[PDB]
């Protein structure tokens, strides 16, 4: 469990992320797709994108980046009390989208990388540690739901 001090570090940088959700969403999805190409295959709507330039020019990709970050922000602001927000997500990602937990680990790495490049002053080692812990909590909770449903993997 994250301490009150750790949540403060997480939410402080997230407030900055909310200043430009669309730009952040783009950077994160593009990093995910370039670093782990297999993740792009899960998206019928993005499968046609072959270069970073094409990804950067896609308004649909930008719009969906807002979708991911808005859902994640709703979860982070619950400070661990995210049962109602996480349930629907785990259900859809395990049974409909078929996203293995490993991919959630990949997107967490992308999020951390982007926050570091855009918010150095508010994302030192202490904040990086807190953010990693918050993302691991998210993954641990999703993992349990996956196991219940028979998708642990
Ligand atoms: C922090 C991580 C994530 C969050 C908060 C998140 C959130 C969402 C949300 C809110 C939707 C909308 C409704 C729904 O279908 O449940 C969605 C759809 C989807 N997500 Fe994610 N997601 C995450 C990670 C991922 C990852 C890592 C992948 C794939 C590697 C993925 C693949 C999908 C797909 C395939 C859809 C549907 C796309 C479509 O409608 O065409 N998600 N996600």
UniProtKB/Swiss-Prot annotation:
GO CC terms, sorted: extracellular exosome; sarcoplasm
Catalytic activity field: Fe(III)-heme b-[protein] + nitric oxide + H2O = Fe(II)-heme b-[protein] + nitrite + 2 H(+); H2O2 + AH2 = A + 2 H2O
Modified-residue entries (Phosphothreonine), positions: 67
Cross-referenced InterPro entries: Globin (IPR000971), Globin-like_sf (IPR009050), Myoglobin (IPR002335)
GO function terms (MF aspect): heme binding; metal ion binding; nitrite reductase activity; oxygen binding; oxygen carrier activity; peroxidase activity
All residue ranges annotated as the Globin domain in the record: 1-147
Presence of keyword NADP: no
GO biological process: removal of superoxide radicals
Pfam families: Globin
EC number: 1.7.-.-, 1.11.1.-
Subcellular localization(s) per the UniProt record: Cytoplasm, Sarcoplasm
SUPFAM superfamilies in UniProt: Globin-like
Principal location class: cytoplasm
Binding site for heme b: 93
Residues found modified as Phosphoserine: 3
Subunit structure: Monomeric.
Family to which the UniProt record says this protein belongs: Belongs to the globin family.
The protein's role, per its UniProt record: Monomeric heme protein which primary function is to store oxygen and facilitate its diffusion within muscle tissues. Reversibly binds oxygen through a pentacoordinated heme iron and enables its timely and efficient release as needed during periods of heightened demand. Depending on the oxidative conditions of tissues and cells, and in addition to its ability to bind oxygen, it also has a nitrite reductase activity whereby it regulates the production of bioactive nitric oxide.
Protein name according to UniProt: Myoglobin
Lineage, top ranks: Eukaryota, Metazoa, Chordata, Craniata, Vertebrata
């Amino acid at each position: 469990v994250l301490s009150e001090g750790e949540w403060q570090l997480v939410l402080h940088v997230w407030a900055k992320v909310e200043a430009d959700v669309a730009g952040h969403g783009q950077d994160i999805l593009i990093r995910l797709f370039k670093s782990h190409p297999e993740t792009l295959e899960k998206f019928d709507r993005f499968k046609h994108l072959k270069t970073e330039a094409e990804m950067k020019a896609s308004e649909d990709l930008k719009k969906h980046g807002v979708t991911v970050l808005t859902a994640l922000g709703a979860i982070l602001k619950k400070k661990g009390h995210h049962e109602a927000e996480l349930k629907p997500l785990a259900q859809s990602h395990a049974t409909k989208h078929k996203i293995p937990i490993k991919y959630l680990e990949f997107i967490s790495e992308a999020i951390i990388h982007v926050l570091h490049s855009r918010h150095p002053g508010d994302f030192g080692a202490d904040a990086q540690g807190a953010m990693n812990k918050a993302l691991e909590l998210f993954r641990k909770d999703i993992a349990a739901k996956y196991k219940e449903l028979g998708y642990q993997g």
